[PDB]
A paper describes a structure:
In the present study, Klebsiella phage GH-K3-derived depolymerase Depo32 (encoded by gene gp32) was identified to exhibit high efficiency in specifically degrading the CPSs of K2 serotype K. pneumoniae. Phage depolymerases specifically recognize the glycosidic bonds on the host surface and randomly degrade them to release the repeating units (oligosaccharides) of the glycopolymers; thus, the phage particles can move closer to the cell surface and bind to host receptors. Here, GH-K3 gp32 was identified to encode a depolymerase, Depo32, which efficiently degrades the CPSs of K. pneumoniae K7 (K2 capsular type). In summary, Depo32 effectively binds and cleaves the CPSs of K2 capsular type K. pneumoniae via the putative active center constituted by Glu545/Glu423 and Asp546/Glu423 and initiates the hydrolysis process, causing the pathogens to become sensitive to elimination by the host immune system and thus achieving protective effects.
To understand the whole architecture as well as the potential modes of action of Depo32 on the K2-type CPS of K. pneumoniae, the structure of Depo32 was solved by cryo-electron microscopy (cryo-EM). Atomic models were built into the 2.46 Å nonsymmetrized and 2.32 Å C3-symmetrized maps and refined iteratively in real and reciprocal spaces. Both the nonsymmetrized and C3-symmetrized maps presented well-defined electron densities in the core region, and they all revealed trimeric architectures, similar to the overall characteristics of the previously identified tailspike proteins with known structures. In the core region of Depo32, since the resolution of the C3-symmetrized map is slightly higher than that of the nonsymmetrized map, and because of the inclusion of the potential CPS binding, catalytic and/or regulatory domains in this region, we then focused on the C3-symmetrized map and model to perform the subsequent analyses. In addition to the invisible N-terminal anchor domain and the helical-bundle domain (to residue 185) that may form the head of the spike protein, the remaining core region of the Depo32 monomer can be further split into the following domains: (i) a very short neck helix and the connection domain (residues 186–271), (ii) the β-helix domain (residues 272–642), (iii) the connection helix domain (residues 643–666), (iv) the carbohydrate-binding module (CBM) (residues 667–846), and (v) a C-terminal domain (residues 847–907). The three β-helix domains from the Depo32 trimer form a left-handed coiled β-coil architecture that is mainly mediated by polar interactions, whereas the residues inside the β-helical solenoid are highly hydrophobic. Through comprehensive inspection of the single β-helix domain or the trimer of Depo32, it was observed that both the intra- and intermolecular surface pockets were flanked by pairs of Asp/Glu residues, and the substrate oligosaccharides might associate at this location and be cleaved.
Residue numbers in the entry:
A (entry chain C), B (entry chain A): 505 to 905
Write the structure that this text describes.
């Protein structure tokens, strides 16, 4: 506690003999603590109170002891310039390997042995609105059997080394007629199913239909999308082909309450639901009070994924007033979904099409909206011809040709 | 061999006196081997058999001794957590500087002195279908006179720090009429020349036309694209302007056989071919059995690049049955081409156009396909006008206005 420019080179920290430890090393209020290849092993984990950390109660621990200085092989609190390279770590019977908290904001984490703790590899618990965290995490810790929590992925500046966006959407600048604002999407361009809530005020957003639970079948009335994953041929064995997507991180805007829900489902080849989850507006709070992330675990053997927005109470709701709370926290809606690939680009990452040699993709399409031509009633056999000539002239001038 | 948490700090490893060495250091079956600034120099390379590694036979070595524990200044085999920072290295007369093999899967490589070996800087020889490798390589080793092999670029998680995509294409979800499936592109939109194989089953893919060798001229019958590089003006000397692109990396899907070829050509100002190559379906096997990468070396003084698909045997082929082998390995075709820039963003990287302030690029075009209006034969001088009014109404409603 209270040190600066500390180097721990080589050496070892181990709990041989099963003593009761909150952590192997606890670091608080230091500036630049650096660990070079130290050997870490054999912890028998407890919380600061004295509660044992086992598998059976692991989830309980993560809810009730988030702010505790405990729960990891190395606990880091209020440390500037933390850094650990890639040592061998094993036999970790606590919740995580590294825990970060209390405005530890420029850390850097090398690739140590993955999947040794009980729940995560890196557990980030930084939680104050005025902090600006930005860390660097080795990519092989993220696509592993345990991975990192949603807040660590929020704060990981190099997140595009393991993932790509499979959905990116934001609201327009200029509202469409008719509307009273431009805080949400005004069309259903990004979605295969569902509808807009109301055609007289498009600024109410999407329509949210009732669904009793997150594992129920979705219908064409609901707002949702579907895509298929891990499509290998008949001459490939599944033991060799592997799984295409390991985790999915969803980011969207925060609100203090609401009955609307973001829902995600992983389904097998014959339509059956393998796993599923939904999330409420106040779950999206890793970067309170604006936005946040949540994590979905894709089970092995999934063939399709469905994602969307629904209503958890029995009536037809609106994105504006049942997910965004009347824009009390955010004035611009956005939705980004990141796919973490099981193996970097084995199946080819998803991203927008492009070609440096094709002008349609290199610069875009130069067509413009045509000026409004009034419907014509001229019946002397040439007013119709003049209108046709006007329409053809507009088509030629506006790019459609 | 068989160690864990090994640190080699400072020091030196050198072959002064020309002893016969397979490597300077050999590491096998270790966990966390870390090298901090060690001085490596002067190796006289041999293989494990006893074959001298010279320039004259270098290519032969890379084919026949890929699985040998030899051929580099540092050879790493089955090591977790390998790490080397940036020491000075010189006089490396063997194939590569670092060689990685046998499921070394979370490595990290700093920027040591580039271009000291005979063929590569980093040589990745990991080759098992069930491994998931993900490494971090300093960017300055990739755009150097030797660079890294295709497999290392495959496994390099930070590959978007040195390159950008100049072609990215994948197959649609819903097939177009008429087709028997949706495993390949159904349109020729991304391509300037060539045609689809058949108009009665679009799921046969592109048409592949005959080409006798990869250095022959391409015609408008062949499926190919062209773009120009390194466009400096009259007041710039070429010794100052330099070269825009250096190593071009292509991945696409694997298949066990086929006569189709992916072809690439670098051409000088007056249309002449400076260099060229083509690749078979089974060349794309760095991530067997799904996809893989190959590398093309752009010669200095190139002014244009052409890339595309052709047939190496004298008859007209199809992408489905002569490059993808009837979808025996992949159900989803894709093609990504990565340009490694000679000097970062000096000439401006290529990527799709965008503007946060323009709604056409911020959210997309809201136009929708019009409902089918049947051809009309009404000749009393007003049925034609009713049809025109219907067409104008559809145009106004569908966004064209």
């Amino acid at each position: 506690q209270g040190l600066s420019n500390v180097q721990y080179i080589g050496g070892q920290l181990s709990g041989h003999g099963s003593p009761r430890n909150t952590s192997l090393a606890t670091i608080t209020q230091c500036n630049s603590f650096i660990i070079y290849g130290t050997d870490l092993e054999d912890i028998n984990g407890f919380t600061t109170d004295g509660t044992a950390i086992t598998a059976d109660n692991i989830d309980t621990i993560e809810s009730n002891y988030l702010k505790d200085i405990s729960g990891a092989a190395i606990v880091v609190s209020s440390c500037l310039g933390f850094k650990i390279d890639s040592p061998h770590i094993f036999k970790i019977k606590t919740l995580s390997t590294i825990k970060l908290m209390n405005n530890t904001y420029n850390y850097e984490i090398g690739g140590f042995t993955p999947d040794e703790a009980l729940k995560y590899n890196v557990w980030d618990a930084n939680g104050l609105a005025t902090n600006r965290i930005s860390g660097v995490i080795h990519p092989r810790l993220v696509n592993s059997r345990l991975g990192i929590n949603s807040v660590a992925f929020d704060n990981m500046s190099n997140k595009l080394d393991v993932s790509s966006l499979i959905h990116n959407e934001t609201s327009q600048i200029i509202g469409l007629t008719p509307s009273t604002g431009s805080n949400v999407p005004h069309t259903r361009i990004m979605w295969s199913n569902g509808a807009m809530y109301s055609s007289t005020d498009l600024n109410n957003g999407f329509r949210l239909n009732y669904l009793s639970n997150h594992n129920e079948p979705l219908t064409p009335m609901h707002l949702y999308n579907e895509f298929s994953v891990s499509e290998f041929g008949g001459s490939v064995t599944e033991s060799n082909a592997l799984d295409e997507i390991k985790y999915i991180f969803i980011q969207t805007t925060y609100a203090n309450s609401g009955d609307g829900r973001f829902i995600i489902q992983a389904l097998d080849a014959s339509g059956s639901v393998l796993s599923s989850n939904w999330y409420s507006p106040q779950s999206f709070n890793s970067t309170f009070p604006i936005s946040g992330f949540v994590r979905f675990d894709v089970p092995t053997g999934a063939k399709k994924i469905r994602y969307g927005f629904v209503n958890s109470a029995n009536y037809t709701g609106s994105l504006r007033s049942h997910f965004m709370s009347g824009f009390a926290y955010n004035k611009r809606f956005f939705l980004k979904i990141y796919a973490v690939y099981n193996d970097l680009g084995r199946y080819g990452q998803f991203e927008p099409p492009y070609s440096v040699a094709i002008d349609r993709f290199r610069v875009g399409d130069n067509t413009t909206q045509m000026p409004s031509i009034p419907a014509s009633s001229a019946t002397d056999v040439a007013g119709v011809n003049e209108v046709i000539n006007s329409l053809l002239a507009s088509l030629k001038a506006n790019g459609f040709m």
